[PDB]
Design a protein around this ligand. Structure first.
Ligand SMILES: [Mg+2]
Length: 236
């Protein structure tokens, strides 16, 4: 039915919004509501400006907690396991930057974020840092070697896919590659023979394995990459 608006919408960093109540309850508290990646979070605050803590629970039982700083300059979005204390992920966002920290210690860092949503991206992994760009569509981290560019894409849902392009002026030495989304594996081909598989693991590591001289089967064992140089060597 027709009704009084009992909340105001407040703008936060990273195009987030929070609804805060116009008046306080008997405990002196203002009600807060926000929708974050399709989950409605709710909380109460002793401030009237939109700052405070909101909580929600995902379908898989994980606990979500959003902390909005007093001056509205920063937001922290934590996801915990159903125990409410084992941290799965933490994303901290301000005007112009954001950092996502994973359970395994790796981070995605976004800086210089522009009015169109684009910016610089860095993925801090064990042993090395991958850099690239953020757009409103996705994050792309690149490694380059000669005329080859390897591109690791991360979708807005966190899904990883990889692609390779080679501007080599010689057809015979040009690298091409195909991605297998079921195995998160990139297979590189040169001169009509598969040469190596780059496996992007669930542990945020990469492994490399060579094919035999005929391109018909993998040989040896997969080697875990620990250095950026090893990725560049794979692209030679
Ligand atoms: Mg290709």
């Amino acid at each position: 039915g027709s009704h009084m608006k009992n909340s105001v919408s407040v703008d936060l960093p990273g195009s987030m919004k929070v609804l805060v109540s116009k008046s306080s309850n008997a405990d002196g508290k203002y009600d807060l509501i926000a929708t974050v990646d399709a989950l409605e979070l709710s909380g109460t605050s002793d401030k009237n400006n939109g700052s405070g803590v909101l909580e929600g629970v995902k379908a898989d039982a994980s606990k979500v907690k959003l902390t909005i700083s007093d001056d509205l300059g920063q937001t922290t979005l934590e996801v915990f396991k159903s125990d409410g204390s084992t941290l799965v992920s933490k994303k901290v966002t301000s005007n112009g930057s954001s950092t996502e920290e994973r359970a395994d210690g790796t981070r995605l860092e976004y800086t210089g974020i522009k009015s169109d949503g684009s910016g610089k991206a860095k993925e801090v992994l064990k042993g090395y840092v991958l850099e690239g760009t953020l757009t409103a569509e996705k994050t792309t981290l690149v490694v380059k070697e000669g005329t080859v560019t390897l591109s690791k894409n991360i979708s807005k849902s966190g899904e990883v896919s990889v692609e390779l392009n080679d501007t080599d002026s010689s057809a015979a030495t040009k690298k091409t590659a195909a991605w297998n989304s079921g195995t998160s594996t990139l297979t590189i081909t040169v001169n009509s023979k598969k040469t190596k598989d780059l496996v992007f693991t669930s542990s945020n590591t990469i492994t490399v394995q060579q094919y035999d001289s005929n391109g018909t089967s993998l040989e040896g064992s997969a080697v875990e990459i620990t250095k950026l140089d090893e990725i560049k060597n794979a692209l030679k």
